[PDB]
């Protein structure tokens, strides 16, 4: 089935996520962003194995598989839930979700893939940053993406995934920067350095010093991949071949062949480290949770009391609603780890 | 000599920021900025024609020779004014002002060239921007470097130069996003896009559509160039090779050969861009000047007689000083164009 020495904790987080107790209680997280055009996005097909588009938390939920061989996914999304056919009706799936659901939203939409291609991880992918609105955006585009995006990444639980194109000096990206700000101490910010193939030449050099953690330092490092460019995506070539030419690509590399063989390179590389560090960063939360509970539910207890223990009526309800959820969480990790 | 239908005017603002009057009279100017890794410097260079490192305001006063032929030089900072022997010793030069002088400066170093390969043309190179604090930088370095550009651009006076690789979403880039901040209008904003070769193959059109200015709109457009890569640098390739290779690049280029034949594309005619739109910010300040040194001069004045027409007799004295050289800069301008 799965294997059950990781699954539990990671299946924890992922049900109390989904009773909606996130907006009131923090629960460990690894938050993707990156700048508009970060390459992201490939990342994300690369480690589901599957093509997406192409806006709003896409709650990335992967299951290994150690058993039946068989493709499954589901999309779900407010009231909905859609078992997804096959591989390629994922992308279709998102985008009818997006759709159904969509300023920029703070609304979910969760995608569970159990497949023996991904690892045990659960990831929120978060809306690219921009500076200065384009198009018909509204003006303010850049505050409203930093709200959605702080929302996670200021609290303690959320480990920060920040990705970046090999080209672009870190310490210019806004994501970095947004990071820092959250977690000066770099303690729990990881980098993911993209599009290594177009890295001008004769600066590899200042790549590999990125890589190594010796220019902006992170206590949990940098990883370095070659996920499908838009010429590849263009062609659907299969997330297979891609995870094929990234490989070769490193093996052959006279700078980057290094990283490779220091276990920073590649997204199965990558995703190894991504389930560990999520495991440690629920790990981390284990102990706390019950008390964090308790705390969260006496607070909105005393919030109760104001409206009194019409307008009147449904404030009572959705602090009520709220209560009842914190509840639910207090009985499901009551059940750990079954 | 020189074309004497244009310097004119370009001479002019030189001499009054030589004065320097510009702490407290705007001069026109086109101030150069970009993010951390922009490839200004090497747009800088392909418009000098000489190589430069590789900090603080740089003054490039480039003046087109019809006449001798003979290649000169000379760059001033401070006390100092030296002659540079010839072309290959700019670099030296430019590094020796730097150390000599040089947190963040705001000390400007001249470099003036005449040659027959640069334009009539002086450009303000400014710091490139940086998000987060690297090595040993002051961790408020981004304010800093902000703080310097800030007072160029915010001045109705300054066209912002905004260098982007055209590899980057230009909507993500922090240089645009100050350029915006003081000129919402983008009426005095110019876009150069660098490194059009490291583009991801099947993203081109982007580029083109941004070229065209069809994304984010500027009055005055966009140029793309293609100036020495790190790895033509490293081998010394010269200037006017590179100018060689620039013109064959976007002669063969599959999509940007559109840009080259609608005249956004190249170093010469972007020299040719930045000579006509100096001319036309200068000359949009020449009616004002005098009525301008004349509202300064007095507010200057009133602030004089508070130290009474120690500390006391210096403050009387720097404030001589400024009035004293308005006065200068009002002669000078009385002499306009001889």
């Given at each position: 089935?799965?294997?059950?020495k ?14 909606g107790?996130?907006?009131?209680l923090?629960?460990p ?9 970060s ?11 599957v093509?997406?588009?192409r806006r709003?938390p896409?709650?990335?939920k992967?299951?290994?598989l150690v058993?039946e061989d068989?493709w ?10 859609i ?5 390629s ?8 979700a997006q ?5 920029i939203?703070?609304?979910l939409?969760?995608l569970?893939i159990?497949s023996?291609?991904?690892?045990d991880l ?9 500076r ?6 509204p ?23 920040v ?14 920067s947004?990071?820092?700000?959250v977690?000066?101490?770099g303690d ?5 350095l ?7 030449k004769?600066?590899?050099?200042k ?14 490092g940098?990883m ?8 590849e995506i263009?062609?659907?070539l ?10 070769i ?16 390179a590649?997204?199965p ?14 790990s981390?939360?284990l102990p706390?949770?019950?008390?964090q509970?308790?705390?969260?539910h006496?607070?909105?207890?005393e ?18 609603e709220?209560?009842?959820?914190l509840t639910?969480?207090r ?8």
């Amino acid at each position: 089935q799965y294997e059950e020495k990781v699954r539990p904790c990671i299946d924890l987080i992922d049900s109390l996520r989904a009773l909606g107790v996130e907006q009131d209680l923090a629960l460990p997280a690894i938050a993707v962003i990156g700048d508009q055009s970060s390459g992201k996005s490939s990342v994300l097909e690369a480690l589901s194995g599957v093509a997406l588009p192409r806006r709003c938390p896409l709650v990335l939920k992967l299951k290994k598989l150690v058993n039946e061989d068989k493709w499954r996914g589901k999309v779900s999304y407010q009231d909905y839930e859609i078992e997804i056919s096959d591989a390629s009706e994922v992308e279709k799936e998102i985008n009818k979700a997006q759709n159904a659901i969509a300023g920029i939203s703070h609304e979910l939409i969760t995608l569970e893939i159990s497949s023996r291609d991904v690892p045990d991880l659960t990831l929120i992918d978060l809306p690219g940053i921009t500076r200065v609105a384009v198009g018909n955006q509204p003006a303010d585009i850049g505050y409203k993406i930093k709200t959605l995006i702080k929302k996670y990444i200021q609290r303690q639980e959320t480990i920060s995934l920040v990705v970046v194109p090999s080209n672009v000096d870190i310490a210019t990206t806004e994501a970095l920067s947004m990071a820092q700000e959250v977690d000066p101490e770099g303690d729990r910010t990881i980098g993911i350095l993209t599009k290594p193939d177009l890295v001008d030449k004769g600066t590899e050099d200042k790549v590999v010093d990125v890589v190594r953690n010796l220019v902006f330092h992170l206590k949990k490092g940098y990883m370095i991949v070659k996920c499908r460019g838009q010429q590849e995506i263009q062609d659907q070539l299969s997330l297979s071949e891609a995870l094929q030419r990234e490989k070769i690509f490193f093996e052959n590399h006279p700078y980057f062949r290094d990283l490779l063989e220091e276990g920073k390179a590649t997204v199965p590389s990558l995703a190894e480290k991504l389930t560990s560090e999520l495991i440690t960063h629920i790990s981390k939360s284990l102990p706390l949770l019950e008390n964090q509970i308790k705390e969260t539910h006496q607070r909105i207890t005393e919030e109760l009391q104001k409206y009194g223990v019409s307008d009147t009526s449904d404030k009572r309800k959705f602090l009520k609603e709220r209560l009842a959820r914190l509840t639910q969480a207090r009985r499901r990790l009551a059940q750990f780890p079954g």
